[PDB]
Structures are given as structure tokens and as C-alpha cells.
Design a protein around this ligand. Structure first.
Ligand SMILES: Nc1ncnc2c1ncn2[C@@H]1O[C@H](COP(=O)(O)OP(=O)(O)O)[C@@H](O)[C@H]1O
Ligand SMILES: [Mg+2]
Ligand SMILES: [Mg+2]
Ligand SMILES: [Mg+2]
Lengths: 28, 473
């Protein structure tokens, strides 16, 4: 659909690198 | 509707390609790049009070925004959304600091790798309400309200190693029914009671189980339905026993079944889905309001009840018709579209990216924000009021005095907190601590004209001295 093209336009580059690097400290 | 409430949100924070960065430094840049006066505690991390009465500070290596005290769930939505705008602007300003870091912020609750961080709700209640009633009536409600409060998550289990989609980010991190913890072994009911108000009168209920929501409808329902249930508990209205077997196990089982068919086993023998149990709370809330007020119900209470019922009816019918209202449904609709279009299994990295970037605060890159930009999400408040709420406090709580003081006399405010404002007057040896102990005093109706007339903080402190038990308590 049309909205998946909007999402595709803005998704972060290097998706697998991005996901693997998204590492957070524990909070509350 | 009227109950003092507020929302704290810890934001995920990412600074890629900067080996000098750590989360504490990045979070400090966000807080410091936005702004004001420092926190009155009565290692000191970056911590500021904003002119809308909110707190912006570094907590547990995350930047955290805590709304001003508000009196109803629409205002909770408004000042919480102002928080998102403040975070986005803070990060943009941080990019102009000498270090030049590109900082990404996420209004979510997990990195999908075993770490979670918190969106807390705070509710002012009668000290006299017995805590055992608070626990036994809220646990089943909190176990099930994720059917409309959940923000969605790709990956099952705290470590994310199970394949699939679930309703809530927080559920896998909860381990016990009741306790003090907020960072590990988390309890469904957190017991900390720090009202920053008269502890002879008030309890502050500190709720930690909810996901941060992007959707304004989801945040409105989360705060509004919980406040209605709290009124029932305070009044001893609930005569049924809603308790369930293994409530921590049921919280996870509910989250892990987005078809909404899993049945809770109630101690009284009933077997109900989470949607069905929510309908039982809604029906009691309707009876409570009818019994108490008749048709003399305020419009917001009627609206919360109507939206609560309409949402539960649509959830039982076909949850995908709620893709404009609920976060997990809006997210799931994108995820399933990619799964169909590209034949992706639930372990695909692209689905993890959608799960996370949905919560990106950038207006041009965050997926929720893109949905809003294309008219694909229902809104509760309009953007002009959100922008105003970034810098103006609510009129009907003590945040009014706090925020307006900072806006008008900021240079002479040494420090502030939820229950104090501390003035540094020129020529004065000492600091002047003005206590603001009652959440519903220090409002515009109490001090707005006084603040209007005063041209200096010295004039204001003169007008207020000996009048603390008029303006603030
Ligand atoms: N008396 C009260 N009742 C309910 N909520 C309150 C009261 N006083 C302050 N709050 C709200 O509680 C939250 C406190 O935030 P914060 O200072 O981050 O708390 P914590 O110590 O839990 O991290 C804010 O949203 C604030 O508006
Ligand atoms: Mg906090
Ligand atoms: Mg916190
Ligand atoms: Mg908290």
C-alpha cells in the first residue's frame, strides 16, 4: 500500500547494523 | 474528571559512530542543551525545572521528562506530548554543542536485548484507602489493560530470543506481584509512596507497568481508565473478586497472545479473556458513575467511559479496525504489511527496526510521526496546544506557580521541586524557601493575579510571606 512506501522512504539505513547496535542501559 | 496525576517517561538514547560518547554524557547533553533552575533535593546529575512546571533530568543513563501535575487525562496527554517535542528539540540543540553529537531518542521501553526502561504513571489518592484493596483490585486490571495500552513488541521473552509479536514491551520484565523495585525483579504493583504533599492526607500511587505510548488515544485511555478504577477502589465500590491465578504468568501470556483469546483463570472459577475482564471493570465503572452522579457526569468522564467501551467492543470484534487509535495495532499493521509484501519471518531484522523506529521522536523519521503526517492516526489534542504546553504550565495545579515563577523570575530562582520554590533575592543573606505542599493550591486562581502584579521576585516574596497557609497550603 501507499503507507509502506512512506515508511520505506524513512527507515534507518544499514538496518541490521542499526538493530544490532541499539543497546540500552537498564532504567526503571 | 479530577484526579492529580503525572507521567514520567525515560527515553531510549542512541549516539551512533561516536566512540567518546556514553549514555550519561549523551543524556546530559539533551537535558543541558534544552535549558533554567536546578532541582531542590531538600553525584548531582543534570536536572532542570521547565517553565511549564515539568522536570527534565538524567535518570539511570536516560533523559527523563516528568510532566507537571495535571488534573485529568486530556491534560496528561497534552503535557506528555509536549515532552516528546521537548526531547526532539533538545536533541536538535545538542547537535550544535561543541561535541557535535547526533543523538537519537526513542519514546519506548526496551532495546529488545534484555534491557528495559520506564514510563511511570503517578496518581494522587486518599491515604486512608487500604493498600490491600489497592493491590487486589489493580493487579487484574493491570494484567489486562495492555489490550489497549500496549505499544507492541517484536520478540518474545526478556532477551528477545522467542519468535513472534506481543502486545507489550514491559510484560516480559515483570517478575513479582508487589514490591519496591523499579529496575529488576519488577512488581506489578510498586509500593513506593512519596507524595511530595501532606503524607497525613495523601498517597501517591506510583505505577510502573505501562508501556510508553505514542498514540494520544492510548495514553488518554491508560490514564483515564486507571483513574476511574482508582475512584472505585477508594470508595470500596468493587464487591467482586477479580483476582487471577498466577498473575505474573498471566501478564506474560496475555501479552504473548495478540489474537486476544487467552483465558485468565479467576480465583472465583470464571475463565475470561483479558478483553472480557476489562469489560467487567468498565461495567462497574459505568455503575459507579451512574450511582454517584446520575446524568450529572462531567463530559470527560463520559468520554473516557465511551472510548473505553468502544475500544473493548472493537478489540473483541476485529482488533485491526483500531489501527488509527492503538499503538500495538498501528505497529502491527505496518509489520504485517512488510511480512506479506516481503515474505518475512518474525525474526527478520527489518521488523525489529520498524518496532524501534516507530518510537523515534523525530517528526521526519519516526514512524508514528509519519503516520500522523499522512493522516493515518487519530489525535486527541491539536499541535498548537502541544506547543503552548511546552512552555506554559497547567492552570489548575501548583505547577502553575512553579512554571510561571521560572518564566518570570527565573534569574532569582535558586532551585525548585514538586513541593518547593527557592528564591535568591538580591541583598539577602539567605535563601527563601516557599513550600508548595498542596497539589491543588498555588493555581492560577490562587496566585495568578498576585504574579501579574509583582514586578520583582522581592515584591512577590514580600506579598507571600506569612501567607503560605493562604496561597499554598
Ligand atoms: N502529589 C502528587 N500526586 C500525583 N502525582 C504527582 C504528585 N506530585 C508530583 N506528581 C507527579 O509525579 C511525577 C514525579 O516525577 P519524578 O520527579 O520523575 O518522580 P520519581 O521520584 O518517581 O522519579 C511527575 O509526573 C509529577 O507531576
Ligand atoms: Mg522519575
Ligand atoms: Mg526514572
Ligand atoms: Mg517514577
Amino acid at each position: 500500500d501507499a503507507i509502506l512506501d512512506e515508511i520505506d522512504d524513512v527507515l534507518e539505513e544499514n538496518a541490521e547494523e542499526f538493530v544490532r547496535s541499539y543497546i540500552q542501559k537498564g532504567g526503571e | 474528571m479530577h484526579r492529580v496525576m503525572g507521567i514520567e517517561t525515560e527515553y531510549g538514547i542512541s549516539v551512533p559512530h561516536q566512540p567518546n560518547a556514553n549514555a550519561m554524557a549523551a543524556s546530559s547533553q539533551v537535558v543541558n542543551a534544552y535549558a533554567q533552575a536546578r532541582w531542590d533535593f531538600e553525584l548531582g546529575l543534570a536536572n532542570v525545572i521547565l517553565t511549564n512546571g515539568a522536570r527534565l533530568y538524567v535518570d539511570h543513563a536516560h533523559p527523563e521528562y516528568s510532566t507537571p501535575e495535571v488534573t485529568n487525562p486530556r491534560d496528561a496527554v497534552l503535557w506528555d506530548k509536549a515532552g516528546e517535542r521537548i526531547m526532539a528539540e533538545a536533541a536538535r540543540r545538542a547537535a550544535d554543542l561543541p561535541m557535535g553529537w547526533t543523538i537519537q531518542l526513542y519514546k519506548n521501553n526496551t532495546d529488545n536485548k534484555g534491557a528495559s526502561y520506564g514510563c511511570h504513571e503517578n496518581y494522587l489518592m486518599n491515604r486512608s484507602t487500604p493498600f490491600a484493596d489497592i493491590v487486589r483490585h489493580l493487579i487484574p486490571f493491570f494484567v489486562t489493560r495492555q489490550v489497549f495500552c500496549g505499544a507492541g513488541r517484536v520478540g518474545i521473552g526478556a532477551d528477545g530470543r522467542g519468535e513472534g509479536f506481543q502486545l507489550s514491551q514491559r510484560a516480559d520484565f515483570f517478575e513479582v506481584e508487589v514490591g519496591l523495585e523499579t529496575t529488576l525483579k519488577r512488581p506489578i504493583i510498586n509500593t513506593r509512596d512519596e507524595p511530595h504533599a501532606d503524607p497525613e492526607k495523601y498517597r501517591r500511587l506510583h505505577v510502573i507497568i505501562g508501556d510508553a505510548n505514542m498514540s494520544e488515544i492510548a495514553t488518554y485511555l491508560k490514564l483515564g481508565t486507571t483513574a476511574l478504577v482508582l475512584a472505585m477502589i477508594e470508595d470500596g465500590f468493587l464487591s467482586q473478586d477479580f483476582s487471577v491465578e498466577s498473575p505474573v504468568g498471566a501478564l506474560r501470556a496475555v501479552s504473548h497472545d495478540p489474537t486476544l483469546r487467552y483465558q485468565l483463570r479467576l480465583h472465583d472459577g470464571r475463565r475470561l479473556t483479558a478483553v472480557q475482564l476489562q469489560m467487567e471493570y468498565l461495567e462497574q465503572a459505568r455503575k459507579y458513575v451512574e450511582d454517584r452522579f446520575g446524568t450529572d457526569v462531567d463530559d470527560m468522564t463520559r468520554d473516557v467511559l465511551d472510548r473505553w467501551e468502544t475500544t473493548l467492543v472493537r478489540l473483541a470484534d476485529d482488533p485491526m479496525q483500531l489501527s488509527r487509535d492503538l499503538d500495538w495495532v498501528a505497529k502491527l499493521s505496518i509489520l504485517e504489511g512488510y511480512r506479506q509484501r516481503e515474505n518475512l519471518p518474525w525474526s527478520a531484522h527489518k521488523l525489529q527496526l520498524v518496532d524501534l523506529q516507530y518510537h523515534d521522536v523525530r517528526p521526519d523519521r519516526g514512524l508514528y510521526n509519519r503516520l500522523v503526517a499522512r493522516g493515518r492516526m487519530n489525535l486527541l489534542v491539536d499541535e498548537a496546544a502541544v506547543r503552548t504546553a511546552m512552555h506554559e504550565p497547567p492552570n489548575d495545579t501548583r505547577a502553575y506557580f512553579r512554571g510561571r515563577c521560572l518564566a518570570k523570575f527565573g534569574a532569582e530562582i535558586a532551585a525548585a521541586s514538586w513541593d518547593s520554590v527557592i528564591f535568591d533575592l538580591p541583598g539577602r543573606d539567605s535563601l527563601q524557601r516557599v513550600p508548595t505542599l498542596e497539589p491543588l493550591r498555588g493555581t492560577r486562581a490562587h496566585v495568578g493575579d498576585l504574579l501579574d502584579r509583582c514586578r520583582s521576585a522581592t515584591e512577590l516574596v514580600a506579598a507571600l510571606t506569612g501567607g503560605e497557609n493562604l496561597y499554598f497550603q
